Design a protein around this ligand. Structure first.
Ligand SMILES: COc1cc(CCc2cc(NC(=O)c3ccc(N4C[C@@H](C)N[C@@H](C)C4)cc3)[nH]n2)cc(OC)c1
Ligand SMILES: [Mg+2]
Length: 308
C-alpha cells in the first residue's frame, strides 16, 4: 500500500539488473498476483553486454497491497533456492532499486498449455472445435506424450527440491518458441487464511477440479496431491485443453469424488495412458505413483509412441 521507497526490497548483486537495461513491451497477462509484460533485456549475460534477450517482467498492480508485495518477493526468493531446470519458469533477474519491483523470468512465447493445445485441435470429431482464429499445425501422437513427459520431469525436479505446487494445471504450464514445457506459478506463497472453493480465477477457472480429495476436504497438500493434479493435466493434454468434469457442478463434485467417480477416457487416448491417469486419481494418496515413476513410464512410452 505504501510507496516502494518506504520498504526494503532484498538486493542481490547476482540477480540485480539496472532498470535502463530493460525495454518494456506489450502486456502478456494479468492476475490477482500481478501484471506480466514482454520485455527486452540488454546485456543480461554480461559475457555479452551488447546482447538483447526477450524476457517476461512480472510486477505488482495499482491496487496491490503490502501482502501482494511480500508474495512477489517470496516468489522471487524461493525460485533462487529451488534452482534451475529446463522444464520450469526460471528466474533471470530482478529490479529492486530505482523504482517498482520487477521480477524477470524466462519468456514463453506460445502462452500456456491449454490455449496452446486448443489452437492446434484438428477439425475432426474426436475433439471439440478449435476456438482460435490463428490455428497452428496439429501435434503428433508422440508430441503429446513428449509434452506430458516434460511436465513430469519439471514436477519431478520440484518434488526433489521439496516444492509443492498446490495448483498444477494446464493453465500453469507455459510453452516456449521451441515447444518446451515450463511449469509456472510453483513459487507462490500459500495463503494463511482459509481458501474459497467457488472462487473462480482471473481467467474464470475453478481450482477445485485439480485438487486432490484430501486437499479438498482436509486441505492436505503433499507431493501426491500434485500427482493427482498431474492426472487431471494428462486428461487436459489428450483432450487438447478440455475442461475437467464436464457438466459436473462444483457442489456435486465433492460427493462424487468421495463416491469414487472418475473422468471417462478421452476419445483419442491409449489405455496405457488412461491407466496412468487412474493411478494418479487413486483414492489412497500413498498408492499414487511418484513423479520419478511417472517420468520412467512416460519416457518409455515416448520411445514407443509414433510421429506418424
Ligand atoms: C501473472 O504472472 C505470471 C507469470 C508467469 C511467468 C512469466 C511468463 C509469462 C509468460 N508468457 C505469457 O504470459 C504469455 C505469452 C504468450 C501468450 N499468448 C497470447 C495468445 C492469445 N496467443 C499465443 C500465441 C501467445 C500468452 C501469455 N512467459 N513467462 C506465468 C504466469 O502464468 C500463470 C503468470
Ligand atoms: Mg489461472
Amino acid at each position: 500500500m505504501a510507496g516502494v521507497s518506504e520498504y526494503e526490497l532484498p538486493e542481490d548483486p547476482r540477480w540485480e539488473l539496472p532498470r535502463d537495461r530493460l525495454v518494456l513491451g506489450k502486456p502478456l497477462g494479468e492476475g490477482a498476483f500481478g501484471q506480466v509484460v514482454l520485455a527486452e533485456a540488454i546485456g543480461l549475460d554480461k559475457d555479452k553486454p551488447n546482447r538483447v534477450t526477450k524476457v517476461a517482467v512480472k510486477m505488482l498492480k495499482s491496487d496491490a497491497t503490502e501482502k501482494d508485495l511480500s508474495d512477489l518477493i517470496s516468489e522471487m526468493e524461493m525460485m533462487k533456492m529451488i534452482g534451475k531446470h529446463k522444464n520450469i519458469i526460471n528466474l533471470l533477474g530482478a529490479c529492486t532499486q530505482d523504482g517498482p519491483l520487477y521480477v524477470i523470468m524466462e519468456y514463453a512465447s506460445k502462452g500456456n498449455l491449454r490455449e496452446y493445445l486448443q489452437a492446434r485441435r484438428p477439425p475432426g470429431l474426436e475433439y471439440s472445435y478449435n476456438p482460435s482464429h490463428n490455428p497452428e499445425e496439429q501435434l503428433s501422437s508422440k508430441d503429446l506424450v513428449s509434452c506430458a513427459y516434460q511436465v513430469a520431469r519439471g514436477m519431478e525436479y520440484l518434488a526433489s527440491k521439496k516444492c509443492i505446487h498446490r495448483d498444477l494445471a494446464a493453465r500453469n504450464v507455459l510453452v516456449t518458441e521451441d515447444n518446451v514445457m515450463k511449469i509456472a506459478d510453483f513459487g507462490l506463497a500459500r495463503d494463511i487464511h482459509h481458501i474459497d472453493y467457488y472462487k473462480k480465477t482471473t481467467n474464470g477457472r475453478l481450482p477445485v477440479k485439480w485438487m486432490a480429495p484430501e486437499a479438498l476436504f482436509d486441505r492436505i497438500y503433499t507431493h501426491q496431491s500434485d500427482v493427482w493434479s498431474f492426472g487431471v493435466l494428462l486428461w487436459e493434454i489428450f483432450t487438447l485443453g478440455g475442461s475437467p468434469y464436464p457438466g459436473v457442478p462444483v457442489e456435486e463434485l465433492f460427493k462424487l469424488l468421495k463416491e469414487g467417480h472418475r473422468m471417462d477416457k478421452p476419445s483419442n487416448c491409449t489405455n496405457e495412458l488412461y491407466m496412468m491417469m487412474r493411478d494418479c486419481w487413486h483414492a489412497v494418496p500413498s498408492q499414487r505413483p511418484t513423479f520419478k515413476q511417472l517420468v520412467e513410464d512416460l519416457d518409455r512410452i515416448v520411445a514407443l509412441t509414433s510421429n506418424q
